[PDB]
Symmetry: C2
Subunit: 261 residues, 2 copies
């Protein structure tokens, strides 16, 4: 059966590469400097202004709001990328349609956070498919509640990146998150746990072979699902406070529908 | 790291201490709950009158709260004594010992409270009593809905069918979490947990060989514990702003 898990691992790796614009391997080359050309750096107001005329941005008057909304609309794309990737997990599309929607609804936040770490180091985050790099200093120093909305993401990423996972590890881990049988309102939990039981076996085997000197990394990576749940819940508490205080965040109602999460 | 026979030695050490540290084992809890026993049989409290009769045998919502609290404090004492036997714990920096306990006792109390529960109620008074979920859930003000989440967790956790020899290692793994806030030396804590995790993995493989990926499923329960402990502390705060009950100093320090 071991070679079936390696086949599942490779299948997920291959699909992961097709689904997401910027892999972690490629992000690491950019971030470390062992890379091709150099990304545009946003480190203060003026450099943001020039970058807009340079790289494609996910936003479209105050600066902190625009950066916030850029994070949201980039998340809207990541949802579609994750949704396409989920369809390639063996067994997923045969699940009850309402269950597929439920798993995605409750999993995209944990996966976005997870994959955002691939694009971050302690000093900043890649944006616009790696062509830009926005610094932690600038993001953290944004006004009112936006500064303190950005910084928790880096604090998570820095801890998570200490596990030193590569894309072949992450392709299976992401699948494990999606196939969580404890999401509220699932109709048929059994086939979801059956699939997740397979992915877990594959994650375990992948980690033992790809990180043979990293003891109990499997266990440590599952413990990171504690950090993911925590931060997604406080994330939601943060969005509420922003929405109940900021009515200078007026968008066209159609855009508001699009990002309603 | 370890040879398999050292891990089995570690499992037995922890099971043995667990038995010495905790009054009411899960095996004894299941013997009382499932029944078929004329001697181990509990008095059942399901309403006000049976609560009045239970006092002679073995405000109402507050008195039950104080019953839960006094037992939690004893639980903290028992967990602390058990922690002292986990190899390496007492050799850790003294502030880290406090830190690990401060953040681990709530997750463990919840874990071990499940052992005393079924879907219909909870053992009390070292097993001599049994208070029903229905009665607890129906308490007034904020206390009814403070009781029910414990049952909601217990039913899910007990579906794993762990016995005490599994739980002894699981409890140790929780205590030795290197990701607790404010630890000074995470590495020695992680070396110990790597050993405890290796021991848990082997214990579950041998004691539940037909239960695939139980190790992973049990670790995913440490996620549920983090959420519920947080909701617990948030509920206690709201209750404190209406009820002037008071808390034991041991619990008082832990929640600061
Ligand atoms: O294009 C621009 O203008 C832009 C400007 C700033 C940052 C980014 C890149 O941001 C991301 C890229 C990717 C990616 O490419 O894989 C994924 C996520 C983010 C990102 N989501 N997020 C959130 O709050 C968030 C999260 Cl974590 C999860 C779910 C939903 C959201 C929300 F919808 F609410 F946003 C961030 C907060 C801080 C930072 Cl620093 C980054 C993110 C792009
Ligand atoms: O003596 C009576 O009258 C009595 C009547 C009902 C139940 C119990 C037994 O309860 C427990 C026994 C044991 C044990 O035996 O090891 C352990 C825990 C509880 C228990 N703690 N708790 C809490 O809110 C709590 C918790 Cl989880 C953790 C830390 C602090 C507290 C707090 F201090 F705030 F209470 C409960 C809530 C509901 C239920 Cl059902 C049980 C508990 C005794």
């Amino acid at each position: 059966e071991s070679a079936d898990l390696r086949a599942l691992a490779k299948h997920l790796y291959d699909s992961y590469i097709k689904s997401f614009p910027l892999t972690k391997a490629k992000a690491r080359a950019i971030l470390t400097g062992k890379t091709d050309k150099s990304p545009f750096v946003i480190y203060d107001m003026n450099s943001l202004m020039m970058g807009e005329d340079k790289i494609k941005f996910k936003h479209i008057k105050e600066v902190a709001i625009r950066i916030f909304q850029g994070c949201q609309f980039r998340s809207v794309e990541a949802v579609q990328e994750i949704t396409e990737y989920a369809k390639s997990i063996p067994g997923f599309v045969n699940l009850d349609l309402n269950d597929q929607v439920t798993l995605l609804k409750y999993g995209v936040h944990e996966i976005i956070y997870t994959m955002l770490a691939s694009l971050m180091n302690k000093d900043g985050v890649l944006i616009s498919e790696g062509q830009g790099f926005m610094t932690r200093e600038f993001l953290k120093s944004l006004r009112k509640p936006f500064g303190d909305f950005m910084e928790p993401k880096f604090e998570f990423a820095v801890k998570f990146n200490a596990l030193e996972l590569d894309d072949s590890d992450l392709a299976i881990f992401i699948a494990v998150i999606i196939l969580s049988g404890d999401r509220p309102g699932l109709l048929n939990v059994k086939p979801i746990e059956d699939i997740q039981d397979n992915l877990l076996q594959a994650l375990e085997l992948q980690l033992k072979l790809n990180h043979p000197e990293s003891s109990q990394l499997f266990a440590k990576l599952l413990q990171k699902m504690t950090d993911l749940r925590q931060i997604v819940t406080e994330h939601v508490q943060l969005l509420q406070v922003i929405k109940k205080t900021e009515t200078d965040m007026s968008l066209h109602p159609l855009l508001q529908e699009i990002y309603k999460d």
